[PDB]
Amino acid sequence: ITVFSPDGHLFQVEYAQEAVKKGSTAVGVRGRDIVVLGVEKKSVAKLQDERTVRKICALDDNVCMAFAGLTADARIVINRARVECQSHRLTVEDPVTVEYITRYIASLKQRYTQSNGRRPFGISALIVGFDFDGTPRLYQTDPSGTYHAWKANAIGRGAKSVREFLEKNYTDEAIETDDLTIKLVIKALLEVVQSGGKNIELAVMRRDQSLKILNPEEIEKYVAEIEKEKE
Amino acid sequence: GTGYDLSASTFSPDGRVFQVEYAMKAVENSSTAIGIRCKDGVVFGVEKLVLSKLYEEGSNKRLFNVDRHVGMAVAGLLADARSLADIAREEASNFRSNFGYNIPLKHLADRVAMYVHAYTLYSAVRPFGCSFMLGSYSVNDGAQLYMIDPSGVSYGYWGCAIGKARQAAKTEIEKLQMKEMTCRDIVKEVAKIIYIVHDEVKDKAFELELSWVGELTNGRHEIVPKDIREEAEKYAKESLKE
């Protein structure tokens, strides 16, 4: 946990990375006037409501995040992040910046991965949102605690494959408007998982709006037309 | 006692703690130190094994002076010996200040014994690797000599040894009769014993380190004068030869 490998790798952070790799594919796109998140779903939920398994959440109104890995540590980090957002809104009385909360989460992960009395978080928080001036944002922390801004990131199951596919696909022409960003995110998710449908958990957030969990009916119709475009 | 010899808080199936025994035997590893409690006073003798000529004379001194009256001869690890010497100095000074008179040797002996035993109790801290002979003489208390085994025993001795040649030294001492004589002859006798116990084949060389406390030095632990040490060394060499 606090010991380095001969090559200079902390074992705990690498194990957390493996846990993240076993997690779902959190996919996001930094669109202008619109930020789109997307996370692979294990369907199931035959007797369980989708409300409690919502991997994509809203830290306040101007920030929404998704994770990939263990869901318990994800829940606790989400709780801490939203508490920090509320505390900032109370004291400073300003909308919390995506950079601010991303740095807070990265610092928390760094603290938990440094001390040997506690294990690192086994998740990678993919954070999106709009700042005070309305600039779209896209960030991705790691168990180590390295927060990095991205144009369109994708972390989780087969992270590298989806990331390179999206890099090949991501272009300003594809980032224009918002429907196009939705198509990009859905395409990345479908590339990850061929089944699609219920597995595609889609969330969108606009410039001056809150996080809108896109309804499954909207998700499937976008998939259908995406299929139509391919033919 | 395999498996039960890694911690000082673990009892072996037989019922003994092996760390303390290893501390005693590591004390054995060092060169022998001898103390004698004669009627006049207490005389110390240590086989100061010289390592290299580079070290200046007096370095790695084994005979510490806890106070004006109380001295100490040590064995085993010298770092632990110095730490215990500092602790005994602090205790003696504290008693001298709070009560106003010099500490009886028994009080220092059992206090340091309790401290070392406390160290032997716990698994975290390791037992002290040094055994020392808290010896002193007082016009009222009398010539007293206490050995503090790392285990934590405070036994009053008339003469004892600690180190590699402890057994042979004890045999020779018990051949000697340590009652009713001046320390002037005890210095010669202890030098003689040190010479016999010394092994030239294994130990390349050694230096005689003799200190005494008694009426001759007005109950003060002071290194023996150079002339007396030379006379004792000459007598020991003459006795050893042939």
């Binding site: - | 395999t2 498996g3 590893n29 060092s30 390592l51 085993g76 690890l77 010298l78």
Partner: protein, 250 residues
């Protein structure tokens, strides 16, 4: 993987192998080396397998000056044809996921060569059973069904204590955590129905010379190796716990 020292490829037909095991400490290997030195068992070959980390050194059993200047690889085998006695000698730690190939290779070797009885000296952990190890004798045995009934009745007459049959995942499969190699080797032998016996001892890590003496005495009691001062310790049993006293420490 037996490679003869010379070129005659001595046959081990109708012999009894004496193999050690990587047990708690080095009880099995120490006892094996001790009996090798005592019985003056000459080297006959070199069991070169890809399972142990390689190591080299002079002859552990120096004896004569000429014999002193030799080479001892990780896996070498000595034998004494006078008593139809052969003995392998392990002196190396294992490579990950290579012990079972060793088990298979040595089982095939003994089956093909003709070595009938393989004796596996080893040692298990001190706690062993549910406080039964503290109450009962550390020594045990574990002999495969294929073992000759004569040896079985000899052991029964010796009035020894059989293996506790430690509870494992189904329900009482013999488990020897200290030996490690011992369990898999025994299972391989049982599959091959090769006569062998595991002679272990509940001990803990540390100095294990007395444990080796006890185990060799156990083996002497069974097979009358020497005489059921006593055992001639190898010259290898030197500087096995330290490298001298640093003068500045004391």
């Amino acid at each position: 993987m037996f490679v003869p020292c010379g070129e005659s490829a001595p046959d081990l037909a109708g012999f009894t192998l004496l193999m050690p095991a990587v047990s708690v400490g080095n009880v099995g290997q120490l006892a094996m080396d001790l009996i090798i030195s005592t019985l003056n068992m000459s080297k006959i070959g070199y069991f070169y397998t890809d399972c142990l980390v390689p190591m080299v050194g002079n002859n552990p059993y120096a004896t004569t000056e000429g014999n002193s200047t030799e080479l001892s690889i990780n896996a070498e085998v000595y034998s004494l044809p006078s008593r139809k006695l052969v003995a392998l000698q392990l002196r190396s730690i294992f490579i990950k996921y290579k012990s079972k190939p060793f088990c298979e290779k040595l089982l095939s070797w003994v089956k093909s060569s003709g070595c009938a009885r393989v004796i596996v000296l080893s040692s298990s952990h001190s706690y062993q059973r549910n406080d039964l190890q503290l109450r009962s004798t550390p020594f045990r045995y574990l002999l495969t069904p294929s073992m000759q009934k004569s040896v079985q009745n000899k052991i029964k007459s010796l009035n020894w204590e059989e293996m506790e049959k430690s509870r494992c995942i189904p329900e009482f499969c013999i488990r020897i955590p200290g030996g490690g190699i011992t369990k898999t080797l025994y299972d391989e032998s049982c599959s091959k129905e090769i006569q062998m016996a595991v002679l272990l001892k509940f001990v803990s890590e540390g100095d294990n010379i007395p444990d080796a003496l006890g185990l060799v005495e156990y083996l002497n009691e069974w097979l009358q190796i020497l005489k059921p001062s006593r055992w001639k310790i190898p010259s290898s049993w030197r500087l096995l716990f330290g490298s001298g006293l640093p003068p500045a420490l004391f």
